Structure 1
Amino acid sequence: KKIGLFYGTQTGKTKSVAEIIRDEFGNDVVTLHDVSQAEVTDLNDYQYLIIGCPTWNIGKLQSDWEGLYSELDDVDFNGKLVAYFGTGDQIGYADNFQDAIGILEEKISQRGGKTVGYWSTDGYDFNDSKALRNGKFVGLALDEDNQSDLTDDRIKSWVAQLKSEFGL
């Protein structure tokens, strides 16, 4: 209802984290949107938005989000509060860890979106990320490949941080 969660997924991993974020907020609060089936004007249907995106070869947006990225100039995000999460592999892609949510955040915040849900880099091992803003991550960084065991507590903490920042 109130929050729209817009995710893109190639191997199902960002999709399953989205479901866990959805159940943590309440199914009554967040509705899931796979960007493969989305129009970019679907983002207009919400004042509170959650962006979910993994980084793929080579340091690119997942392909469904990549498709929409070009059209982001056609939507106005002013007044909207926007959160970001991604899944990533910090061991194999230490130079591009979570680039996708940083790429998306740059554009959306430029087109009006107000970023909520900044996350600590304490607990990760990487060299570089387009997702860094004053030494914080732009949203929750998940690692299902190397750090899957940490993911449930990260979601629980971040959703609680978000419920508070969104005003639920």
Structure 2
Amino acid sequence: MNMGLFYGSSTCYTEMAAEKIRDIIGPELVTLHNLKDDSPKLMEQYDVLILGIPTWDFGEIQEDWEAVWDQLDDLNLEGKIVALYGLGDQLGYGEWFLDALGMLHDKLSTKGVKFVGYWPTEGYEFTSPKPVIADGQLFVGLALDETNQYDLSDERIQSWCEQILNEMAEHYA
């Protein structure tokens, strides 16, 4: 099977997250779906669809993602595998963490996708329900940072990418 990897073109860092996910899992089976580069209805094709969005980089949801966010609910998506991730910083923001991840989760829950990946909430502090599941026991997608632990954001991408490729595969088998 194959993976599309979509993100908002105007947002910082998501380009290198996308490059690295695709490199790590493998560029023969992952495809970049930068929204400036290809249209949103292409998301329907891929057996897996990885979503990446920073929360409050320039602001909540930059234009290149919002311009199609309204159409992402028109897409069928039934039964497809999905990974979600986003970036924020829990030092300087806090509570407003991963809220755009939470919105792509909330849009997709009724579309009947499978969410792979998640992230451990242990060691984070928040009260917001949108970026999490299981009464706050997991983030509903990968948590990235660039302020407090930027040295190991590579580790977060690596280990999560290996995990989602396993967990999506054991799911489909």
User: When the two structures are superposed, what TM-score results if normalisation uses the length of structure 1?
Assistant: 0.89
Distance 1:57 1:21 in 2: 20
Partner Cα separation in structure 2 for residue 164 and residue 9 of structure 1: 28
**Which structure 2 residues correspond to residues 135-150 of structure 1 after superposition, within 5 A?**
135=136, 136-150=138-152
The reply on whether 1:156 has 2:165 as its aligned counterpart is no
Alignment of 1:70-89 (within 5 A): 70-89=70-89
Distance 1:151 1:72 in 2: 28
Structure 2 segments unaligned to the other structure (5+ residues):
none
CA–CA distance in 2 between the matches of 1:58 and 1:110? 29
Q: Deviations over 1:61-81 (max 9, x none)?
A: 232221211112211111200
Q: Is 1:15 the counterpart of 2:15 in the alignment?
A: yes
* Deviation (angstroms), 1:57: 7.1
| Structure 1 contact 9–53 (Cα < 8 Å) conserved | no
* Aligned partners of 1:91 and 1:126 also within 8 Å: no
Q: Shift of residue 146 of structure 1?
A: 2.4
Aligned to 2:45: 45
The Cα of 1:38 is off from its aligned counterpart by 3.2
1:113 positional shift? 1.5
State the identity %: 48
- Which ranges in structure 1 are unaligned for 5 or more consecutive residues? none
Contact 1:77 1:109 in 2 (8 A): no
State the AA in 2 paired with 1:90. Answer: Q
Please say which of residues 8-17 and 40-49 is displaced more in the overlay: 8-17
Indicate the residue corresponding to 2:30 in structure 1: 30
Report the more deviating stretch, 147-156 or 33-42: 33-42
Q: SS of 2:120's equivalent? A: coil
**1:126 CA drift (Å):** 4.2
Preserved CA contact (<8 Å) 2:53 2:86: yes
Question: In 1, are the aligned partners of 2:11 and 2:58 still within 8 Å (CA)?
Answer: no
Q: Give the corresponding residue for 1:94.
A: 94
Alpha-carbon deviation of 1:11? 4.5
Q: Does the CA contact (< 8 Å) of 1:96 and 1:130 recur in 2?
A: no
Structure 1: which amino acid aligns with 2:49?
L
Describe the SS at the equivalent of 2:78. Answer: coil
d(CA) in 1 for partners of 2:112 and 2:149?
Answer: 33
* TM-score where L is the length of structure 2: 0.87
Conserved in 2, the CA contact under 8 Å of 1:117 and 1:139?
Answer: yes
Q: Is the 8 A contact 1:83 1:115 kept in 2?
A: yes
Aligned to 1:61: 61
Residues 54 and 86, structure 2, Cα contact 8 Å, conserved in 1: yes
* Matched-pair contact (CA < 8 Å) for 1:96–1:129: no
What SS does structure 2 have at the residue aligned with 1:36?
Answer: coil
Q: 1:62 to 1:124 in 2, by over 3 A?
A: farther
CA contact (8 A) 2:11 2:54 kept: no
